[PDB]
Amino acid sequence: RILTHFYQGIVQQFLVLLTTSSDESLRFLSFRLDFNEHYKAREPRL
């Protein structure tokens, strides 16, 4: 469970670091990986 929560809390930061980026090109990755917004509408997951 700690392994799970650690992984999810890394992905939470990874996704919000792809929407503060320069150039649309790298923002496109952030949508493919997180489609549902079951993760990221705030700093913890949903």
Add this chain to the structure above:
Amino acid sequence: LDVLNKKYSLLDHMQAMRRYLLLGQGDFIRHLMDLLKPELVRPATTLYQHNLTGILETAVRATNAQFDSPEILRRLDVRLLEVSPGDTGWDVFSLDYHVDGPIATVFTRECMSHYLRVFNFLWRAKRMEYILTDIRKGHMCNAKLLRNMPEFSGVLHQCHILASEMVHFIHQMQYYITFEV
């Protein structure tokens, strides 16, 4: 741009660039790492270049680049980088696709150095995709070999969902590289 196109071929080498160096072939890149897996998960201490060069031929013949012209298979070459303490197998090994002749005015030396700087990162990602499929493989094997008691269910199911968290992340990232980059 006629005579150089009919005595050598800048188009074929630039297409083979994407396949051999930028992993674009796909069929060959799976088999080549299914043979070179044990030597790569070893450090660069028991590796010497000639051994790993020999391995390539079997996989090229085995997959479908055997109908290619022999020239673009000869121009494909293996290297083994600098050995110094701190060795591993995915920071010291490289594939390469050299350019010799009057066709090397399309690429500078620095351009190929950058085409190798991309390669090591691509090779890392390609490796991780097989480590996770080994995980997924073992999940499938171990919910139909050891399942005779219901005592295993919690730990088993929990690891399975933990895998599927990584699977949709990495698989789709490998698709992103693929259809955009």
Add this chain to the structure above:
Amino acid sequence: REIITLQLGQCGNQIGFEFWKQLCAEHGISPEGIVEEFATDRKDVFFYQADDEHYIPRAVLLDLEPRVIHSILNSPYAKLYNPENIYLGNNWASGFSQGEKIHEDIFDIIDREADGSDSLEGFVLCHSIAGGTGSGLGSYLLERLNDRYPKKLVQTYSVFPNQDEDVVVQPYNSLLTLKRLTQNADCVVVLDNTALNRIATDRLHIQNPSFSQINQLVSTIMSASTTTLRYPGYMNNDLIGLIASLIPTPRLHFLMTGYTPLTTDKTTVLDVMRRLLQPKNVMVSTNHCYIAILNIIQGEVDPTQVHKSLQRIRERKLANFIPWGPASIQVALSRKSPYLPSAHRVSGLMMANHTSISSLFERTCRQYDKLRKREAFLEQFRKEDMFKDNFDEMDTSREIVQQLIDEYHAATRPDYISWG
């Protein structure tokens, strides 16, 4: 890597025959196997580079009361594949017992072709659920394959037994076979006979030759699903990668079939995406929500089209989501095959894990429960009595399929830290 395809039963040999004929017409080979001059490809996935310059497919030919298999024998596609391994009904118990007594030499046949190819990725079973001939023997061979080789993949292309049907032991046979499918398989591809029947009676006005046209449909789907393995891409050049994303857990491994043209007898990715997401371009016909969808497209695809199409699919929300996580429809691009007919130049197919198949399962469970409560529809089959005098395997299969329905409904929930 390399796939060894297994075909058994009259319906299974029928769909394998049409699939092999389809791949013969698709790739550059004659019905003898003679090489063509137009053939980024691979001809080593279903085909061995065999030893008379015919790319002979690795196919296990099994016959049980052969009628149509005799027609397969005197055929020009019998010069394409025959490694000479043909070895000899209307019940699951009869086919199971007949497969039980002769498992040795047919396992030697499996061993021969396993030694035949250099590498192996999976075993694809041409199977018909409660088809009589395929039934029982298919479930027993599924047990033999998954027990004997735990390191490989098992795939079972399966039909759902509803053909507007007389056989009343069919729910018992389908229930026992489904127990084997849930317990002895890594992945199952399921189709509905009634759905393909409705689509066929829609697109044409055929009523009598429904079998052969359904065979055309499943063979086209089977070629379309393995196009990404047969033609080198970047991902799903092995089976397990395509199998991985749709299947989140070893119990939910049953996949819906979609393919966006129902026609082959201008277009963009955006239109065929929105045309794919309806449940009436699905060839398998409370809250029902997909676990994961994967779509593969083949054609003259502009790479910006998949991008803005997936934009539209997001903000329209025309796909059913997964509560417990992200696992969504994934865009895959594949090569257009040589010598395929030039209609629907941009053509896509989808494979998806949906909870809606639980409804079809519980319908067949309800049919079994009705005939089991009445106790007048076992018909006293002698192989059914001698195989199990107590008929506790029906109870065990009912328990397993009930656990399956409960796990389906639990995956439907926003919590899947609650199991079944």
Add this chain to the structure above:
Amino acid sequence: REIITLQLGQCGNQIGFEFWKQLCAEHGISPEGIVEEFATDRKDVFFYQADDEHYIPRAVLLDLEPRVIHSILNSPYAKLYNPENIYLGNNWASGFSQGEKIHEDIFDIIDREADGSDSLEGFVLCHSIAGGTGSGLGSYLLERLNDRYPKKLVQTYSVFPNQDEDVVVQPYNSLLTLKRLTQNADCVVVLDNTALNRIATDRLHIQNPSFSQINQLVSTIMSASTTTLRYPGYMNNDLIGLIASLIPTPRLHFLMTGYTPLTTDKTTVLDVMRRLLQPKNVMVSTNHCYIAILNIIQGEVDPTQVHKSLQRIRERKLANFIPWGPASIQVALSRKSPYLPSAHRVSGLMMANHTSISSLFERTCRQYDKLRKREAFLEQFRKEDMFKDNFDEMDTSREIVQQLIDEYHAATRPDYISWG
């Protein structure tokens, strides 16, 4: 947005058949649905972009004692529309009771096509008032549609039952259906059978095939009314905008039909405006005053012509006014359709809310009152007795239509702060 058209009864399936044939000839499609090379338009209002490259209309095919529907079956326009939903008289009570017992699966048919289109604007009912086959089932389905979906529009193209007629229960049937029309519909388009009969016996010298020629008239009117939706303009590209101005209140929702050529078998807007305003170019034949008129014109219209024509219409005063407010004839301009015959190049139609239809209502009420006072013309229909042994629905419908007549006469007054 998108319109789903419902057709039922022999007369309703007749007018739907001719309307679909008219829109097939109008737009660039074959009777199979094959695309043409000449087709600012839209083909998504009555048509789904359907899945064999035929723009198949979303039509609900209902049959009740089918005779002409069999002729619709073996037809080249059965390749244009057939989503395969055909499911099975001379009385309102019989059709009502038969529709009552099977409302579930026909509601599932409605649900299927409601899931079929992406958007929805309204339900247009091909209906015949006291047509026997359409009657009863149409009123019951009207109750089902308005109860089940309160967020959409209900339109009913209706005839007025006077065909120079033997059926003596026809006033009772028309009275009950009119109760349903007043209470369970958002808007009703009403025509007179005798008016179209007079116009047809005028323009030609036909006496026997009056039905088919009337079908031509109503299909042309139905195409003309939805031309502004099918071809993108600026307003009335949705139904509710055209419905809004003519209907001032939920009780007065019955619209007269006008269309200024009675001919299709040079011209300016000014002449066709003054030709439209007479009550003998109206296809529906004390102080009688329109509530609101709306006219839509299609042709080679100079934009100054509508301007000075409306000038002339004002200072001539050839239209009947509304006391309690401004609500007048509105000029709308629409595109001339491709592949329409080139007669009357400037052609307009009108829809208007008039109090003169109260006269036709009270005439039919007087016929009902006569047969009801005599008590010899119920004929003791068994479905009429079993449906209502006390026949209080006739009294309730009489009360509702009396309130309707009173509200009509109250809207006629300069005060409509006096109600009924």
Add this chain to the structure above:
Amino acid sequence: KRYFLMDQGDFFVHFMDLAEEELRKPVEDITPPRLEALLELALRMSTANTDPFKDDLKIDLMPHDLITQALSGLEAFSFDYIVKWPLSLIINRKALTRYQMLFRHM
């Protein structure tokens, strides 16, 4: 003329019905990519898809048209037309600015 002056009213009947909720939110709340994507959906439903010039439908948010001679996404929303080099002698920046207000009014 086709979009601002509304020769297509089919390019709008989808779009108003589809985006009535997501426009009514405040202008600062609404993000710019969401508008453009929904616009492409309604562009494909419309027959302005068969018009080759539909590739100049963009996003520009504007403060008000009741200032000199909005606060929500509707009436702040505008399109931005982009033209080629020899079309500066007819189509102008001042003309683009004046066209935008006309659309917002309607």
